[PDB]
Design a protein around this ligand. Structure first.
Ligand SMILES: OC[C@H]1O[C@H](O[C@H]2O[C@H](CO)[C@@H](O)[C@H](O)[C@H]2O)[C@H](O)[C@@H](O)[C@@H]1O
Length: 402
């Protein structure tokens, strides 16, 4: 009978690809359907290019794709409309914000799978060691704590120790980190939901300058090459006081044999001052049936299974990834394993989105502009003032007649 083929997640990022393949095989065994898993590169923007090869070809060789929250507006022509396959009651079990994000010109492109928000990981043993009782609330405090703990850990002999790691590589992850920096300085959303390109302002410029000031000082010089896993591996070996990353890193850090197990917490990222808004960039993935799938019925069944309560629960318990069903955030087993899901739920709900709705099918070009201009500041090629002006001009060209 049919072979249902799935491309989504990567075995290069934590346990996501291995776990996704396991869930697909479980569905296959449950329903007596043959399945195949096709691996993907680590970085979301590389995945988009890979999947676009299949879509350009109208290829029937993948039935189900795991698609980034930033993609519906780009990928909608390649998605089977799921709306007729779900009842209104079924759809209401997901956060309405994500269902709305996934709906493009009335087409439900994809089912919400897991959400995501940028958070601050911090070594609580080290905060205590150095006389701090709370994680930092402001970027200035983060800097002061990092300098002090670094001075001490280096003096004690850990020459590998850094104050802060984050995603500074030129790719989509840096758009995520940079939106957090800019927004948390009161510098706006880069492109506002109304279309206004707002990034050329002194608060956004300050945010980028500040981040440059970390590189080679509290963060490794090589941070300008780090994606999620490069940052996580410095952190997880016990060599960083702080890390900006997504929820998945938590379960990995708690695993048996992790050097940092039991030694860290998570909190909202810092901000410039008490009246700036908190910033956590909205992430996460959705489940799309290919418009080119020869087996829509079976592929829809698989996507419903993957998005189900018990598969999302398993994702939360084992991989510390955030459900897209509000009912899971009150589940006793989810909460006992991840108590921070409760503490940060409002951070997750107030996550700031990248400008994917407003940029639509042009979002990838906009983000490339953002990450290359931000990167030119991290590398020291440009100051923030010049980079936000140059970025404004680039985005104006991209979106001109959008
Ligand atoms: O659970 C974390 C996931 O990390 C990646 O996805 C996040 O980071 C991307 C940027 O690098 C965002 O565009 C995305 O929205 C985030 O969810 C990774 O691509 C995933 O497969 C991981 O599960």
């Amino acid at each position: 009978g049919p072979v249902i083929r799935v491309a989504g997640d990567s075995t290069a990022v934590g346990e996501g690809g291995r776990w996704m393949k396991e869930m697909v095989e479980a569905w296959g065994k449950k329903t007596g359907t043959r399945v195949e898993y096709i691996d993907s590169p680590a970085d979301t923007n590389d995945r988009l290019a890979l999947y676009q090869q299949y879509w350009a070809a109208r290829s029937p060789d993948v039935d189900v794709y795991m698609i980034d929250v930033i993609w519906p507006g780009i990928v909608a022509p390649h998605a089977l409309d799921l709306k007729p396959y779900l009842t209104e009651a079924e759809l209401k079990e997901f956060f309405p914000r994500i269902v709305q994000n996934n709906t493009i010109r009335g087409k439900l492109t994809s089912l919400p799978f897991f959400t995501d928000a940028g958070i601050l990981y911090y070594r609580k043993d080290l905060l205590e060691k150095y006389g701090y009782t709370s994680p930092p609330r402001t970027w200035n405090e983060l800097e002061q704590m990092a300098e002090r703990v670094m001075e001490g850990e280096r003096r004690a002999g850990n020459r590998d120790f850094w104050g802060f790691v984050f995603q500074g590589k030129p790719y989509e992850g840096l758009t995520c980190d940079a939106l957090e920096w800019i927004y948390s300085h009161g510098g706006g959303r880069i492109v506002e939901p109304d279309g206004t390109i707002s990034v050329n302002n002194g608060r956004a410029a300050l945010a980028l300058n500040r981040a440059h000031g970390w590189v080679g000082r509290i963060a490794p010089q090589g941070v300008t090459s780090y994606a999620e896993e490069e940052a996580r591996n410095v952190w997880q070996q016990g060599n960083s006081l702080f890390m900006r990353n997504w929820p998945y890193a938590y379960a990995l850090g708690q695993a048996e044999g992790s050097p940092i197990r039991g030694k860290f917490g998570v909190t909202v990222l810092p901000k410039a001052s008490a009246d700036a808004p908190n910033a956590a960039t909205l992430g996460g993935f959705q489940l799309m049936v290919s418009a080119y799938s020869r087996y829509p019925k079976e592929a829809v069944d698989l996507v419903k299974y993957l998005a189900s309560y018990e598969v999302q629960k398993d994702n939360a318990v084992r991989l510390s990834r955030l459900p897209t069903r509000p009912a899971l955030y009150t589940d006793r087993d989810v909460l006992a394993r991840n108590p921070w899901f409760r503490d940060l739920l409002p951070v997750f709900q107030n996550a700031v989105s990248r400008p994917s709705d407003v940029a639509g099918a042009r979002y990838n070009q906009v983000s490339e502009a953002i990450w290359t201009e931000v990167h030119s500041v991290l590398t020291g090629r440009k100051k923030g003032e010049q980079a936000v002006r140059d970025l404004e001009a680039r985005i104006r060209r991209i979106l001109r007649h959008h």
